[PDB]
């Protein structure tokens, strides 16, 4: 049995409700998913998306997020994958690398719509299983020439999910697998720009089409992840996928470990744990802009790998600045989505911002518990009359092992929508009533 | 200037209007490109594809070629290109190793059809060029690790033609390249399938997609060719396409040289040679199966890479035998459309296909105007009493050096409507009606 074959059948054959653990991250993992979409609601990079699927029609069938409105199937995907990723708000996954949520729970909306909803959850939990072991699989030279995982991984992991959902047999979902392989594309040269994360929803708009062609008995290859020219070795290892791909499938779920991490602050997962840093100095010692001289941020070498903008000029390029989320937490603001928008940043946090200096700690030992592994920082005030005052995070809030109380979950969905609406949808996703979750996310 | 911004420049204020040659064959594009689509009219996967964008719906804006019924503009360069290659009959150019006009015509149609179609000609000419230059640019390891040319490149070249139709800015084609780039993809796993020509119309409709998103005035970056992690460093070699890409552009134009070929025969481009050679032998000698022991076909080593299949057991298998393409000529049949289908082979050229052999010359030298450069094709029949006859082909009618004649691409276009019709979409095209054109291949 080739790769192919051996990831049709194991997608075919899982049984995520068995799991309980699972089940209760798929119901957390589709709030946060609604949460992000929620906030994301007045970008202008919607409204554009909008504008060009109305001039192309569809018959009105799923929810557009938080639009208040309908479109045809493979439209939503695109336009919902959007919307969930748009703001840096949504969730990440050690293993994949990438945005799977963003991917996944488009495609299985659109699925859901026009029926199966009653295997939404253990799709969506199949979903990040394919994701999290391609994203393991592909090898690290994938996403550092230049790849994107959420976009070239996610066409085959959305196509999975669907796949599973919709309960195709061997030969569909090997051809499906296929079919979403021969669309996977994604350049990284496209982060800083609103088509990253149009990536997340072109591979869930990729991935439902995979499985529409499956299903329409289209003919296509049952072996492309197999041979010299398949899916792994053109676009990754083939050698490490053969030994990593399907060993030890859904024992444990991936979307329970390594986990899903649910995000608590619109930016980079990897300046959560200084802005936890920050904020618990800002409320222990008092410090501000005012009384600090400059600030220390301590990473293990590569740990602010992500954190590309040491000197940012917007908020969303402040999205990848551990700086600029130190000296706007400073400054007295919070860590909030209004602040990580296009609008530049002002001087006076500019000025700040250059009073900050990442350093490389090669010897502090991460704690036993730290995400993602081997991570921590350490935020250093220095205070008038040579006084310091030090914090240090390694789990951030939201993260597997330190994650989101039903009040965090609660607060997130709130950032739109009134505390009552907030209820009743958590209330709908706990019941597993998928047919209600989809009336309300429609607003 | 990077090359990003040079093929935006290149493109944009190309003036390949000025050559009388280019749009003449451009002119002749259209008009084979509308003979292949209508010869694959009654092709089930259309039928499958329909279906699939009836479900999603949308505005009947774009003709689905020979039809009779309208979609949506990207639901149209979809299925357009799906129809232009679903036969392997549609056009073929050295430079691009791919189905350059199944994957140009089919975006240029939907750009047409909503206004510029003025511009069609133009565009068509700018889209080949470019093709052409990526294929040329790319590298060889391209397409021997396993990519598809026509989805790879075709993409970017189908978002170059309809922004040069559209009159994108400079910002707004290097945004729409870099759209198209970040969408490219295709496998040459998907060969012997229905997927392999969906391929042309799912990059048909990337680059449309790219083109409306740029003129959205949706984010992206403007440089996706460029650098270590650019499109060229990412799937090819940018040192060549340093040096190639943009080399002497439009002077000639690649329509014209090395030149777009229309194929005579319904199969692989490399079997046309024999399928010449041996018509030549049936009309000169008489040789039939019934009259030749065997027979020997003899290429340039590498010649017959492309005809993988040497023991075929259905048409479709038989569009990559030159063994099936012969032993179908001696059993008197035609080399048409009905004999290259999913039906399988009759047990009696199965028969013959046994005795033909393939053999290789490395000495022979091809000659000069030989297409592709370096082939030829010599097929050799043995008789009784150890006579045998010879034929050899280097420049296989209809590609370039060997063109098609007025009544060739009438009759071509004859295969599926009256005489009346092909002589409407003839004097259409001649005066570069292409309104009226839409209006004639709906049918």
Not at 8 to 25: G, M
């Amino acid at each position: 049995q080739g790769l192919t074959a051996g990831l049709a059948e194991a997608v075919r054959t899982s049984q995520p409700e068995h799991s309980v653990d699972a089940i209760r991250k798929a119901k957390k993992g589709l709030l946060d998913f609604t949460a992000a979409s929620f906030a994301g609601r007045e970008d202008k990079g919607i409204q554009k998306l909008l504008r060009l699927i109305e001039d192309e029609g569809g018959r009105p069938l799923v929810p557009i997020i938080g639009q208040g409105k309908k479109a045809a199937p493979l439209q939503s995907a695109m336009l919902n994958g959007f919307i969930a990723h748009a703001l840096d708000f949504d969730d990440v996954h050690s293993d994949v690398r990438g945005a799977p949520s963003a991917v996944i729970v488009p495609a299985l909306i659109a699925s859901a719509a026009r029926g199966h909803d009653e295997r939404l959850l253990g799709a969506y939990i199949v979903g990040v299983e394919v994701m999290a072991r391609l994203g393991e699989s592909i090898g690290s030279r994938h996403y550092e020439k230049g790849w994107h995982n959420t976009g070239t991984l996610g066409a085959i992991a959305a196509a999975c999910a669907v796949g599973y959902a919709e309960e195709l047999t061997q030969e569909e979902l090997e051809k499906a697998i296929g079919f979403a392989a021969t669309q996977s594309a994604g350049m990284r040269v496209q982060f800083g720009t609103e088509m990253k994360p149009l990536h997340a929803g072109l591979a869930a708009q990729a991935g439902l089409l995979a499985v529409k062609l499956a299903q329409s008995e289209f003919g296509g290859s049952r072996t492309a992840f197999d041979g010299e020219t398949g899916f792994f070795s053109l676009y990754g290892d083939v050698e490490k996928a053969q030994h990593t791909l399907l060993n030890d499938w859904g024992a444990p779920w991936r979307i329970v470990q390594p986990g899903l991490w649910f995000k608590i602050y619109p930016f980079c997962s990897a300046a959560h744990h200084a802005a936890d840093a920050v904020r618990q100095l800002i409320s222990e010692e008092t410090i501000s802009a005012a009384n600090t001289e400059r600030i220390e941020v301590i990473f293990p070498p590569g740990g602010d790998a992500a954190l590309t903008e040491r000197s940012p000029k917007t908020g969303e390029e402040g999205r990848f600045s551990v700086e600029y989320v130190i000296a706007l937490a400073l400054h007295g603001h919070g860590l909030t989505v209004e602040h990580f928008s296009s609008q530049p940043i002002p001087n006076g946090i500019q000025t700040t911002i250059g009073h900050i200096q990442r350093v490389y700690d090669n010897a502090t030992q991460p704690a036993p518990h730290a995400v993602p592994k081997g991570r921590f920082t350490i935020v250093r005030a220095y205070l008038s009359d040579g006084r310091i005052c030090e914090a240090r995070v390694d789990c951030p809030k939201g993260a597997p092992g330190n994650e989101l109380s039903e009040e965090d979950i609660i607060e997130k969905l709130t950032l739109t929508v009134p505390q009552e609406k907030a209820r009743r949808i958590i209330t709908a996703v706990e019941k597993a009533d998928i047919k209600e979750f989809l009336a309300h996310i429609e607003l």
